[PDB]
């Protein structure tokens, strides 16, 4: 028993993870076979970010412009393209230890592991959810620009978020392993602000079923509600509408407690009405929404990888 | 900015775990050297758990009763031996990814990362806290007996913990690398409950320095308060007692963010008077402690490993 926010384990994409240097600009680059991707804001001064013509800037770097370091082993850099806003330096040497990887690009609600990396090198591992107004709320600092977000499905490393800027507000925006943007952010030191953030729903319900199989049932009541009634309270505390997409992905949890989703509809419906009761559901003081109903099965099935 | 729940990367420590079976029970192994670390209980029936003698137990054991996996390569134990708790399985391969590692028994307070595991293969990665009544607040399932809790100390991978048992109350207990339980407990279905549990006080503080760190500044007052004062306060609310010896961790802190100790702790101290008023610190309605003083500078500082 016992539920944490838990990350996938991180060894597969530490060993992909290297230095990419151009002029005084330092930051992260994912080394897969004979590839380094990093954001392209790489090749610019601080003045060019201002407002970049990136196709312009790349045209004027050569080869020898780009500094590629794995460890402490120089990669000779042989070829340089764009990719949206991703760089791809081609390399004269295949990185040995690429696992089996897709570039998958996820949907506002689904979670990842991020590993935060500096000069190439990993400093921790944590896990974020894609916000509805396509932000993360990450931990990153200065240099931790092309720190990747992935999963593993099955036998395979799923790429999905590469990291690119901090908004004012102090969350983060970033791309996929394509190059294209999470939102309506572009890579350019322009004044940009996310839309309006939202609960995600589906992912609320799925924190409820972890702690009722981890034996909380204080907040389970003997109501039951229709979709559309819990939607028209949903709305209200700027939670996401619930969907039957919604209602069948929740069903594995439904099956393995036999709570039907539509009475766990109503209970949640009382704590956003009434409050939590002075009390807390697996340590929270707060309804949690960064759990997706899979990273439940996962964590509660112990699901292993190789 | 931001601010969060932040593991190691597992890498180091995934290159070192293996499957270790006798009879019918499989749990996970530590392979450091020519060495595997396992808990001794592997050896034991569901009878025998009842009312263990180890000394006897193991007697009856021969060396080719331990089947030892690699991923799908068998290790051919060549020794076993019992050091408090923890067996030692010496095996005919020396681990070529064993890293430069130590043993270390943390003090109540100091966190560590878990890399939870079944069948010696990865599920996942989550910070824990050793809790001041020497229990962790795990997720652990059958089989994950023998997952292990680390810190990387500049380019060293210090083993804190090794996963024994969970206690029915759903809060778990193990031992150091040297097979010694932290708290009371032992290797043996017998009636055992650990001591009520404690807020680790000087970790609240070091969050709300986290806090400040990243903007979040409406809790702090201009109040002064002396040790004693602040003592007699915090030991009302169940707060571990705060010495001179903790002031001067949060040293850095303070250095960082020119507050000094005791207006962090006069700042606190209404908090625990007057509650967060409907507010949230870091996105949280419950004060956090299982953040050292040292997690907030790793953090906030981008600290890297090799
Ligand atoms: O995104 C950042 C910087 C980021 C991008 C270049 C290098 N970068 C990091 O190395 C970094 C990565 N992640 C977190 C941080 C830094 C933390 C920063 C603290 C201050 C943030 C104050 C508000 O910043 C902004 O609006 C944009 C403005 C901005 C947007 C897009 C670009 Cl192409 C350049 C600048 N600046
Ligand atoms: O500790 C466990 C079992 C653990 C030890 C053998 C294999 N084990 C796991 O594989 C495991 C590891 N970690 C989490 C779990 C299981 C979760 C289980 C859910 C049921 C928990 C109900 C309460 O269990 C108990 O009190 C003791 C009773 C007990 C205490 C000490 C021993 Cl030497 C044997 C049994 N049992």
Redesign the interface.
Known sequence: ???????????KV??CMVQVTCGTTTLNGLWLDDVVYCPRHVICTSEDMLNPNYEDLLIRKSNHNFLVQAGNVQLRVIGHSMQNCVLKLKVDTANPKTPKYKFVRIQPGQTFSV?????G??????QCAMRPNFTI?????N??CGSVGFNIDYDCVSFCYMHHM?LPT???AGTDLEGNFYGPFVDRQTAQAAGTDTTITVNVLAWLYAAVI??DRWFLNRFTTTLNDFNLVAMKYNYEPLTQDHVDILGPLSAQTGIAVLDMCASLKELLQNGMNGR?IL????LEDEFTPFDVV???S?????
Do not use: D
Not at 115 to 119: E, K, S
Not at 302 to 306: I, K, M, R
């Open positions: 028993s016992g539920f944490r926010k838990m990350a996938f384990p991180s060894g530490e060993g590993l935060a990396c500096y000069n090198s990993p400093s921790g591992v944590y709320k990450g931990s990153f600092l240099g931790s901090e102090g969350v983060h981890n034996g807390t340590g929270s003081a707060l996962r964590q509660c112990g699901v292993t990888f190789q």
